[PDB]
Amino acid sequence: EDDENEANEGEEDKDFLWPAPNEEQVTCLKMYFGHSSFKPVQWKVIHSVLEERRDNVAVMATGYGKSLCFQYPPVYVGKIGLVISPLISLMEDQVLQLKMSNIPACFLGSAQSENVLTDIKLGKYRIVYVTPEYCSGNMGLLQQLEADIGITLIAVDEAHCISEWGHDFRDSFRKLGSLKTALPMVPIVALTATASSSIREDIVRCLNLRNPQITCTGFDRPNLYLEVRRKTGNILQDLQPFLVKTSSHWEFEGPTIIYCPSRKMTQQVTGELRKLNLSCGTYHAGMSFSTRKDIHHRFVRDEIQCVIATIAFGMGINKADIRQVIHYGAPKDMESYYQEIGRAGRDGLQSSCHVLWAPADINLNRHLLTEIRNEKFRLYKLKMMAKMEKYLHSSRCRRQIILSHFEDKQVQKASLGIMGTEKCCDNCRS
Ligand SMILES: O=C(Cn1c2c(c(=O)n3nc(N4CCOCC4)nc13)C1(CCN(C(=O)c3ncccc3O)CC1)OCC2)Nc1ccc(C(F)(F)F)cc1Cl
Numbered sequence: 001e002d003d004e005n006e007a008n009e010g011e012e013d014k015d016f017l018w019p020a021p022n023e024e025q026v027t028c029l030k031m032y033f034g035h036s037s038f039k040p041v042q043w044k045v046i047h048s049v050l051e052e053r054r055d056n057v058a059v060m061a062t063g064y065g066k067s068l069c070f071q072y073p074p075v076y077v078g079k080i081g082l083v084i085s086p087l088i089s090l091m092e093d094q095v096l097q098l099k100m101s102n103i104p105a106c107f108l109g110s111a112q113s114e115n116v117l118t119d120i121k122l123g124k125y126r127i128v129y130v131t132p133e134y135c136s137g138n139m140g141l142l143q144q145l146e147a148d149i150g151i152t153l154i155a156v157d158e159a160h161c162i163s164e165w166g167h168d169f170r171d172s173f174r175k176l177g178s179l180k181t182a183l184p185m186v187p188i189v190a191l192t193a194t195a196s197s198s199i200r201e202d203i204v205r206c207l208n209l210r211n212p213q214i215t216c217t218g219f220d221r222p223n224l225y226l227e228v229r230r231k232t233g234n235i236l237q238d239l240q241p242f243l244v245k246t247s248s249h250w251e252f253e254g255p256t257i258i259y260c261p262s263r264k265m266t267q268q269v270t271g272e273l274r275k276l277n278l279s280c281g282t283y284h285a286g287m288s289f290s291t292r293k294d295i296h297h298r299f300v301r302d303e304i305q306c307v308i309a310t311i312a313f314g315m316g317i318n319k320a321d322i323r324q325v326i327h328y329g330a331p332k333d334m335e336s337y338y339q340e341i342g343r344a345g346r347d348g349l350q351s352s353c354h355v356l357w358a359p360a361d362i363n364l365n366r367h368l369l370t371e372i373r374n375e376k377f378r379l380y381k382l383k384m385m386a387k388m389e390k391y392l393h394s395s396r397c398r399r400q401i402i403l404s405h406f407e408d409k410q411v412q413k414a415s416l417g418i419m420g421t422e423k424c425c426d427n428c429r430s
């Protein structure tokens with residue numbers, strides 16, 4: 001019988017990934033993991049490990065889609081991956097699942113060494129699970145495996161356990177600081193369910209990670225309300241609905257970021273809000289380091305209510321009480337949009353994310369993309385613009401579209417009490 005009915009009339013897996021997984025990467029994913037496609041975050045982590053050997057901190061709310069990020073890379077290159085974890089029963093479960101998928105894998109510890117260690121040294125295992133206690137006393141073994149086989153990655157699960165400041169400190173994690181000393185060229189993928197910026201900083205310091213890629217996925221973010229609205233042809237007409245008059249000035253409900261495509265538009269929008277004596281500042285790459293760091297400082301100190309910025313603004317901010325994100329103009333693509341709205345309401349309190357768009361917007365202009373001479377990049381950019389256009393045009397649940405694109409199916413299936421309600425999105429309200 002038919003297992004799915006996903007195909008739609010007038011629509012034509014790899015599309016929204018840059019660069020695209022190659023044919024053998026997809027064959028490997030189907031053969032060894034029983035999946036047809038990578039989710040964007042899975043590909044971000046996997047590609048960063050394989051092609052850049054880049055350290056990662058991957059915050060993942062649950063195990064749903066998590067294991068692929070550290071299991072896939074060593075399976076594809078046919079070398080070895082190390083998984084460091086204190087979760088013995090889960091490690092045993094994953095080892096058995098790997099064996100049943102015809103991936104040679106084992107649990108290495110003192111009591112298991114007689115059975116598996118010689119075979120690990122001879123490169124017979126793709127994936128080896130070890131405790132931090134065992135790992136701490138065997139840096140010499142890891143150096144031998146790096147020399148004779150090549151370690152694709154070291155995964156550190158429950159990575160928050162390295163922080164004295166967290167709620168689950170393990171003495172056993174302290175010595176994992178030595179991994180980067182012993183193995184400076186082996187990328188570490190640190191995994192945790194804690195989205196705390198403070199704990200992330202502790203993990204990066206304690207594991208000596210170098211410019212790590214930070215991702216945060218597996219969350220349904222029920223406190224983010226999503227709306228797409230047409231521009232009215234006037235900045236003040238467009239932004240007046242967001243404003244409240246108090247004393248002899250206008251303000252937003254709370255701390256607000258307005259993302260504009262152009263530097264010109266950030267100055268144009270700032271100018272209009274300044275006329276209302278609204279507490280705000282501009283942020284783009286055309287400003288100096290001094291001015292940019294001051295805008296950041298004043299926003300964190302709540303000395304400005306609103307930052308009117310290009311998408312240069314965001315990565316540096318850990319601010320938990322962003323009440324409103326406005327995309328003033330169509331966003332660059334759904335990837336950029338997801339990164340930008342993800343910064344809203346990190347305190348878990350009610351926030352709103354509005355796109356104000358026109359069919360005329362620069363990020364919907366095909367002319368700029370047709371000028372791209374590289375065929376693969378041109379077609380990718382056109383596919384991303386089309387996907388962004390489809391989101392803006394949709395009458396379907398905005399949350400369902402974003403979760404379907406970016407998250408494991410479980411985030412939709414585990415999402416209870418927001419989708420279809422008045423607080424979900426404009427399309428669920430109406
Ligand atoms: O929002 C998420 C996940 N998420 C993401 C982020 C984040 O901070 N948080 N925080 C929480 N919370 C989980 C629950 O507890 C509070 C924190 N969840 C996320 C960032 C982390 C990287 N980043 C940075 O600037 C950054 N930072 C530090 C260092 C380097 C960096 O590059 C951008 C924001 O990435 C995007 C994903 N999913 C999500 C779910 C539903 C929807 C909606 F259906 F409603 F549309 C939309 C989205 Cl986007």
Ligand SMILES: [Zn+2]
Nearest residue numbers: 397424425428
């Ligand atoms: Zn909805």
